[PDB]
Structure 1
Amino acid sequence: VANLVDMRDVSFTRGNRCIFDNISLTVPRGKITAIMGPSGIGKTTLLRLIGGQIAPDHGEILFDGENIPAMSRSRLYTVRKRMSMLFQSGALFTDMNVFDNVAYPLREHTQLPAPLLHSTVMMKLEAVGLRGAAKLMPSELSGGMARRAALARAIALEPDLIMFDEPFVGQDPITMGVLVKLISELNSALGVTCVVVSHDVPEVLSIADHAWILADKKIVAHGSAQALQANPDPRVRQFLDGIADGPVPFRYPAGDYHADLLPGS
């Protein structure tokens, strides 16, 4: 199969505010794709969707063949062994320190011997970079090292599809670059196919091999970073550089601006 996951035509409603509509996406294996759009448009919802943790209203999301929804809710766990979200804010377990906070999926799945697992975790930590931070608690690390250790623990099981929920968000350019180098070197080293859903364009497009762009209720553009950078499309041209005013309104809708100053004009 050419792609790793095909979201054929998903419309997700989320009650009364229909989030997605007949959206179409195709993450290919080996390619570190990305999807970007307005902030809080619900793309994290799209991620948590590809994880089965929420079901689509009417659509076929096919991870590596079979459908995510058509799963045994334990067969779902079997296949989800081949995924790992990298949520922002770390999502480290506050109780166990990083070392154990990394080992968790191992001890959960592998039958690994104790001194073997210790070294594998002490190795993934150096991989991501915060090896010396094994003993430290998650409530003690920074906001960047938190995401980094979360990444390290996320690569365990070599998930072959590790999606990033806006990792470089609220991050200085040094940590931003550490992140954009880590998740690049990974795909360029492992066979991992990261799906970075984010909205920091000058950072994402640096490594994104095939990006998608979604307006409020659908995807509007995709392609390569270069073939996207040169897109002549208002909704797209706006987001791609923040012209701050276009088809997305800069001014919130209001009435006439005149009596607003002159009640009983």
Structure 2
Amino acid sequence: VANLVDMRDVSFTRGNRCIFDNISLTVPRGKITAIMGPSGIGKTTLLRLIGGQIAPDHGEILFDGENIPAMSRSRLYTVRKRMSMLFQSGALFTDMNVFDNVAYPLREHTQLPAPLLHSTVMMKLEAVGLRGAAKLMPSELSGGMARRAALARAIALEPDLIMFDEPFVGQDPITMGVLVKLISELNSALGVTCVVVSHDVPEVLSIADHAWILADKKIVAHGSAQALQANPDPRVRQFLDGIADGPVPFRYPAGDYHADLLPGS
């Protein structure tokens, strides 16, 4: 197939505040794509939506052929063995240490022998980089090391689609650089097709091969990292560099400022 997940026409509601409205997206395999929007735009819901953990109201999202929404929920686990969410905060299991945290999806699915699984996990830790942190509990880890350990745990099973939910948010540029080198080295070594959803544009566009920008409730722009920073569109031109005033309003709507200034003039 050409693209690994083709979200043809998805409309999601979540109550009354319509999140998406007939959006279209197409992650090609081997290509690390990205989706960007303002904070609170609903983009993490998009990732949770392409993992089958929540249903689109009126949508045909084709993960490598068959739809995700129309799955037995027993077959969905078999295909979900070919995905890997890397949440923010890592989502590391606080019970077990890092080693037993990376080894978790292995022991859950594969029958690797004990000295085989040990060598697999102590190799994926070295891949990500925190191999010395095998026995450190996930509450002792730093803020960025938790995302790295969860990345190592996410590339276990070689998932063929590892999607990153805001991997660089509130991180120093020195750890932003480690996290942007890891998720490029993986795609350039493995065949994983990273879907990096985020809003920290300066770093995401440094690796994204084909990025989408979703406005209030729909996708407004796409294209490569080069043809995007030249887009002549206020809704996109504002967000791509943060001009603090444009189609999104700076001043929250208010009334007349005068009764607010002098109540009962």
How many angstroms apart in 1 are the aligned matches of 2:138 and 2:10? 36
- TM-score of the superposed pair, with normalisation by structure 1: 1.00
Deviation digits for residues 147-185 of structure 1 (CA, Å, limit 9, x no counterpart): 000000000010000000001001000000000000001
How many angstroms apart in 1 are the aligned matches of 2:41 and 2:141? 29
| Alpha-carbon distance, 1:131 to partner | 0.1
- The percent identity for this pair of structures is 100
In structure 1, stretches of 5+ residues that fail to align are none
Partner of 1:256, secondary structure, is: coil
Match of 2:126 in 1: 126
How many angstroms apart in 2 are the aligned matches of 1:216 and 1:19? 8
Partner of 2:258, secondary structure, is: coil
Deviation digits for residues 212-262 of structure 1 (CA, Å, limit 9, x no counterpart): 000011000001000001000000000000001000011100111111011
| Alpha-carbon distance, 1:70 to partner | 1.1
Runs of 4+ that moved beyond 6 A: none
| Alpha-carbon distance, 1:73 to partner | 0.2
How many angstroms apart in 2 are the aligned matches of 1:249 and 1:177? 32
- Superposition map of 1:249-264 within 5 A: 249-264=249-264
Deviation digits for residues 23-70 of structure 1 (CA, Å, limit 9, x no counterpart): 000000000000000111110000000000000000100000000011
Match of 1:243 in 2: 243
How many angstroms apart in 1 are the aligned matches of 2:109 and 2:250? 49
How many angstroms apart in 2 are the aligned matches of 1:32 and 1:241? 22
Deviation digits for residues 67-106 of structure 1 (CA, Å, limit 9, x no counterpart): 0011110100000000000001010000000000000000
Partner of 2:136, secondary structure, is: coil
Partner of 2:9, secondary structure, is: strand
How many angstroms apart in 2 are the aligned matches of 1:37 and 1:67? 25
Partner of 1:17, secondary structure, is: coil
How many angstroms apart in 1 are the aligned matches of 2:183 and 2:247? 33
How many angstroms apart in 1 are the aligned matches of 2:249 and 2:214? 16
Partner of 1:25, secondary structure, is: strand
Q: How many residues align?
A: 265
| Alpha-carbon distance, 1:186 to partner | 0.4
How many angstroms apart in 2 are the aligned matches of 1:258 and 1:187? 57
How many angstroms apart in 2 are the aligned matches of 1:189 and 1:250? 43
How many angstroms apart in 1 are the aligned matches of 2:82 and 2:115? 25
